[PDB]
Paper text:
Like Plks, Cdc5 contains a Ser/Thr kinase domain followed by a polo-box domain that mediates substrate recognition and sub-cellular localization. The polo-box domain is made up of two polo boxes that together define the p(S/T)-binding pocket. Cdc5 promotes the release of Cdc14 from the nucleolus and regulates the mitotic exit network (MEN)9,16–18 as well as cytokinesis. Here we demonstrate that the polo-box domain of Cdc5 uses distinct surfaces to bind phosphorylated and non-phosphorylated substrates.
Instead, it uses a unique polo-interacting motif (83RSIEGA88) to interact with the polo-box domain of Cdc527. To elucidate how Dbf4 interacts with Cdc5, we next solved the structure of the polo-box domain in the presence of a Dbf4-derived peptide (76RARIERARSIEGAVQVSKGTG96). Crystals of this complex diffracted X-rays to lower resolution (~3.5 Å), but the structure could be readily determined by molecular replacement using the polo-box domain of the Cdc5-Spc72P structure The polo-box domain was virtually identical to the other two structures (r.m.s. deviations of 0.86 and 0.66 Å with the apo- and Spc72P-bound structures, respectively). As expected, the pS/T-binding pocket was not occupied by Dbf4. After a cycle of refinement, the surface opposite to the pS/T-binding pocket showed significant peaks (>2.5σ) on the Fo-Fc electron density maps. While these additional electron densities lacked connectivity and could not account for the entire Dbf4 peptide, they could accommodate few amino acids. Intriguingly, these electron density peaks were close to the hydrophobic pocket defined by residues Leu546, Trp555, Ile557 and Ala567 from Cdc5 and coincided with the position that Phe603 occupies in the structure of the polo-box domain of Cdc5 on its own. To test whether this surface of the polo-box domain was important for the interaction with Dbf4, we introduced a A567W mutation on the polo-box domain to occlude the hydrophobic pocket. Conversely, the Dbf4 peptide failed to interact with the A567W variant of the polo-box domain, indicating that the integrity of the hydrophobic surface of the polo-box domain of Cdc5 opposite to the pS/T-binding pocket is important for Dbf4-peptide binding. Superimposition of the polo-box domain of Cdc5 onto that of zPlk1 reveals that the Dbf4-binding surface overlaps with the surface where the kinase domain binds.
Author numbering:
A (entry chain A): 451 to 597, 609 to 705
B (entry chain C): 83 to 90
Write the structure that this text describes.
Amino acid sequence: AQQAVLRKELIATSTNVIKSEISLRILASECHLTLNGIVEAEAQYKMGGLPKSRLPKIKHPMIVTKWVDYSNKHGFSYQLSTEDIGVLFNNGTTVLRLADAEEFWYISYDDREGWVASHYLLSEKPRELSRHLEVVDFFAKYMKANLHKDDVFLRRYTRYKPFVMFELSDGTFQFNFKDHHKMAISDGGKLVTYISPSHESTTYPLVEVLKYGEIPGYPESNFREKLTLIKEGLKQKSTIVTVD
Amino acid sequence: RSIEGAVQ
């Protein structure tokens, strides 16, 4: 009998706050999906005969390149794999700068339908919004330092100690761990995009990595551990159906 | 061009 124990509970901090329960309900029902898509994959390695026959899809999902937290003068901010910049204000609203930068989406959150957006141009921009772009204009200057399809944005984040969790609008979950190993789940818990500290993206079917016993190529990853951290990560995030 | 993962 293997003498082992469950990992300590996942304590979180500085999550972006939201009122729209239904939005939480979607995330909760969405997290559980990619989690069930993984349990279904772990079952493919365990006792799946010829688990690699009918090929699985292959596509590089979106991801977060550089990110920051801020408390007072500005809100949490981030940048994506499309040279896009987002700003999750302290109130909960988001402003997103597109790749080609002629335009920008302004996202709010509502209880009835959930997240809701509206298209504007920087040139045909309104008044009350301009002061929100002053904030973005600074993150643009900061982010600028550096040492189509249906677009995407960040819904919720959660700062745990061992890592930080990103929940995206396209159904893609991302994790920047402590040891700078960064990973991502997309396609409903079927594809794996490990991006080492060396910013190199490569996607893999989950059933292919499970048989291997580790991340492909990189042995210093300690993969079998991080997977466990993802699971309980989604488990906790999937129980949040309400605000209380 | 509509944004996936939210309502317009």
